[PDB]
Design a protein around this ligand. Structure first.
Ligand SMILES: CC1(C)Cc2cc(Cl)ccc2C(N[C@@H](Cc2cscc2Br)C(=O)O)=N1
Ligand SMILES: [Zn+2]
Ligand SMILES: [Zn+2]
Ligand SMILES: [Zn+2]
Length: 393
């Protein structure tokens, strides 16, 4: 389990995320577990399901312990529930260690497991504050670091239903996985991997919004979300600008809504008419920022259709949010992303696995200096619910 032993430890399907192999219990049960930086629970399918043929069998693990407490996790479009416990956990293609970690055994779920996902669980890599049922349930990566000498850092190379590969390096940075500059942006608060967007450009034109609109009500880096997701005012601005550039094509509404493909004749897709998008992230130095630039190849995603082998067909992978900006697989695929928990920051470098345009490339570039501008962070109104709960830690 060197960094060479962790290179190419991820796999996935397109638009259904990336998974890593983990062994739970003794004797080991090997399971394919989705890597999810936008959540904080380790949870694994643990009863029969029509879309699963393997799951975690608690009864076959001699080292399993029941915490005698349930957890229930509702999402916008489904849910899971289960029994908490602890078991022994290792990553065959990751560090050479075993840890005792919390595991939610998923006993029931709705619209969580889909047809041909090929993962049987979720590895929440975010921080304790967002773990269910409360932040006292220690997340997997926190247990890894407290129990071993593994450095407090991990990095993801996610390479661009269709197969996809990648690398999760645990406790390090592998220079083979990126070229050129590694740029860091501060983690704003340790809950999600929350960051601050100071500027957005579409083919060099500034959206000119109050910078707080970009981060309303947060901006996060989330490997468990497919799209780039944008607060509604920002989404409208961006689509208006993207439509302007590509105006030689008049797409149906449903395309802009992510509901419909649009096609061209095989090999003739007019990429040059779709703009690059640059997101400027707050730099470590107080005046500075740096930009990540994504190609339209990143935000226009291919689906090989069924009455269409003659055609190249695409889905628009930028969608509206009412919960902030989410930089999902659409952003991360271009990049080597370093989650530097130890130093409270997130690095970006251009990935060595590159989905590149004939003329242009996805880029990581700085610094850019701002005499002033602003605090671009948004302060989420504090509920009485969140104010009262004690955090004796
Ligand atoms: C992290 C995870 C699995 C959490 C989740 C829970 C539920 Cl109930 C439904 C969809 C998702 C979900 N949706 C992704 C798409 C997706 C479905 S499976 C892996 C991925 Br990435 C998204 O909204 O972009 N992601
Ligand atoms: Zn293996
Ligand atoms: Zn108290
Ligand atoms: Zn607490």
């Amino acid at each position: 389990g060197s960094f060479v032993e962790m290179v190419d430890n991820l796999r996935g399907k397109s638009g259904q995320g990336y998974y890593v192999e983990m062994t739970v219990g003794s004797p080991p049960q090997t399971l394919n577990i989705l890597v999810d930086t936008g959540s904080s629970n380790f949870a694994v399918g643990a009863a029969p399901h029509p879309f699963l043929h393997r799951y975690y069998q608690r009864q076959l693990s001699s080292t399993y312990r029941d915490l005698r407490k349930g957890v229930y996790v509702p999402y916008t479009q489904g849910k899971w529930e289960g029994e908490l416990g602890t078991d022994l956990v290792s990553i065959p293609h990751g560090p050479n260690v075993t840890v005792r970690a919390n595991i939610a055994a998923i006993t029931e779920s709705d619209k969580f497991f889909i047809n041909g996902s090929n993962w049987e669980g979720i590895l929440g890599l975010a921080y304790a504050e967002i773990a269910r049922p409360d932040d006292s349930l220690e997340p997997f990566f926190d247990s890894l670091v407290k129990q071993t000498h593994v450095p407090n850092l991990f990095s993801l190379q996610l390479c661009g239903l269709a197969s996809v590969g990648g690398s999760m390096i645990i406790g390090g940075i592998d220079h083979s996985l990126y070229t050129g500059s590694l740029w860091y942006t501060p983690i704003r608060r340790e809950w999600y991997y929350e960051v601050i967007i100071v500027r957005v450009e579409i083919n060099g034109q500034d959206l000119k919004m109050d910078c707080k609109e970009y981060n309303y009500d947060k901006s996060i880096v989330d490997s468990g979300t497919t799209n780039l997701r944008l607060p509604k005012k920002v989404f409208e601005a961006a689509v208006k600008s993207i439509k302007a550039a590509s105006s030689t094509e008049k797409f149906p509404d449903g395309f802009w809504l992510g509901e419909q493909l649009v096609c061209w004749q095989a090999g003739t897709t007019p990429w040059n008419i779709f703009p690059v998008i640059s997101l400027y992230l707050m730099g470590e130095v107080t005046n500075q920022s740096f930009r990540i630039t994504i190609l339209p190849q990143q935000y226009l995603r291919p689906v090989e259709d069924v009455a269409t082998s003659q055609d190249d067909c695409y889905k628009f992978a930028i969608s509206q949010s009412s919960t902030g900006t989410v930089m999902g697989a659409v952003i991360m695929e271009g990049f080597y992303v370093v989650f530097d928990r130890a130093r409270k920051r997130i690095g970006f470098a251009v990935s060595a696995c590159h989905v590149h345009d004939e003329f242009r490339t996805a880029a990581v570039e700085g610094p850019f200096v701002t005499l002033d501008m602003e605090d671009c962070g948004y302060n989420i109104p504090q509920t009485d619910e969140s104010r009262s709960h004690h955090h004796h830690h």
